[PDB]
Design a protein around this ligand. Structure first.
Ligand code: UK9
Ligand code: UK9
Ligand code: MG
Ligand code: MG
Lengths: 294, 294
């Protein structure tokens, strides 16, 4: 079982050599804020030269895929295809397209708590949004899902409206992710989707369907058009309760990097408590430590 | 132990006869919205004639005591003294006065998520509020508590500011109550303080000190200036997880009335699960059924 081993030396060469690809979390792993982790671009160049696949998975719903791709480029991660990038905004849009209730001749609408990147992904997946213009008649389409994402304009009034839609038990409640908070450059924090979802769940008495990590649905989304054997995929993340748990639920070897949210002492406390699904198989100080294994 | 018995007949006469007073929840018990429960004013008149004390305890922080007293009068509950009325706004103000950290020569301020009734109670207890004017110097007083109450103007920005104050581990986190939602006249619901507290707790990683029912602190607040033996006090409420649990924690005989939030079938499900602290000793269809026991 996972034992939180510092990955180095021959073990590092063997782990990377057997892996067919690496699935990276983004925030706290490749970068912090607008600062790339030193050595991270060089790791990705060496992985490619070694013929290993690289895929990326983020619970951040700020950027639709085109704006996410440009961010990778800007921070030194060249040569990437947009098809390698998976965010909770993209995967939430796809899940709603796959699962929205209602008849095909009278499609429903999604009431969205979230920002313009998230809304852009929803529309690109064909979803109609509550508040969008009504047809000439004026009869607004029925709301058949509430989607909670990172919403800098969250308000009591929006929370109460979500509850009104959720009075219909057939209306879905979906959340992009459950991350509770995110660190800012000065050591402060900003509230995360999980804090807003907690309010929506508590007021409505409903449990949300979570799209993002640690839900295995995110691995379904990533693998819809790319064949990756989870038994041959390394999952690299900074957050025990999202990235590492995700990896265990999907059957991947997990690596905690220490440049982000979770601390080594937390992983060790989970191991001492026997909570092995929150323990990484391996850790590194930063992902630059992986390059030597190639 | 509590067995959820319908209270009637000789048992009703004995239970009321042995009681020295009755502690009533307000919303869902005395009234629904702006409609008084039929017979409820007459019960309170008969209790007084019988020499039994009546006290009132609400988690609603909309009304400071003067506006709460006028509401009782308007709905037919005459002859009451404001000193009989205890809301989570009043008791939160008193708790903050008793527990606010900081030196006596440089008192702190309270960052409040809540409305004007709540703020009025805080000021009447001597508390200074974040955002109040600064002294001539301009140096704003340090925020030493965050208070979450029912906040119709809750926003992501206010949530993020609360988190900034809570970065100081000595800054208290207090909530007026944890009620998750409240029913409206048309069967919709409005979010409750517990939904907002859930967001604040989740984003900050803190657990709130809850003032209102089911916290026993509310019974400390009620009894500060009135001597009531809990062993001789009947607790009458409509909400299992707040009023009935409160009664059990304080050692009172509990009565569920069915004119409000909780349903008889819920109480029976808790009893079948052995969760006796959420089971009322007795129930009535409405508190008008108690009058015959006098
Ligand atoms: O999902 C989001 C996550 C974050 C985030 C902020 C700091 C560190 C890590 C993640 O910021 C966002 C944001 O600024 C938006 O406008 C919209 C969405 C998000
Ligand atoms: O604490 C409060 C509880 C409620 C409430 C609403 C419906 C049924 C029962 C309780 O409404 C409030 C309100 O409208 C305010 O403006 C301020 C505070 C509250
Ligand atoms: Mg991360
Ligand atoms: Mg009540």
């Amino acid at each position: 079982m996972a034992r939180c081993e510092r990955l180095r030396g021959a073990a590092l060469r063997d782990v990377l050599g057997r892996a067919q690809g690496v699935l990276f979390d983004c925030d706290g792993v490749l970068w912090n804020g607008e600062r790339a982790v030193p050595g991270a671009p060089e790791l990705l160049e060496r992985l490619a030269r070694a013929g290993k696949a690289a895929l990326f998975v983020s619970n951040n719903s700020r950027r639709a895929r085109p704006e996410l791709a440009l961010r990778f480029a800007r921070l030194g991660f060249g040569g990437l295809r947009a098809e390698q990038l998976f965010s909770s905004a993209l995967c939430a849009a796809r899940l709603l397209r796959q699962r929205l209730p209602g008849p095909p001749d009278a499609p429903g609408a999604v009431f969205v708590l979230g920002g313009e990147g998230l809304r852009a992904e929803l529309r690109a997946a064909g979803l109609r949004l509550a508040g969008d213009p009504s047809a000439g008649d004026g009869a607004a389409p029925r709301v058949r899902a509430v989607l909670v994402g990172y919403d800098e304009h969250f308000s009591f009034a929006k929370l109460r409206e979500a509850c009104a839609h959720l009075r219909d038990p057939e209306c879905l409640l979906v959340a992009t992710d459950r991350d509770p908070w995110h660190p800012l450059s000065d050591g402060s924090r900003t509230p995360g989707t999980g804090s807003l979802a907690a309010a929506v769940e508590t007021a409505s008495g409903r449990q949300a369907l979570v799209v993002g990590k640690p839900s295995p649905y995110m691995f379904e989304c990533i693998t819809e058009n790319f064949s990756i054997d989870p038994a041959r995929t390394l999952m690299v993340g900074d957050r025990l309760e999202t990235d590492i748990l995700f990896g265990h639920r999907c059957g991947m070897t997990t690596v905690l990097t220490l440049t982000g949210v979770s601390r080594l002492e937390e992983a060790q406390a989970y191991l001492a408590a026997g909570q092995h699904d929150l323990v990484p198989h391996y850790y590194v100080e930063s992902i630059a430590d992986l390059t030597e294994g190639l």
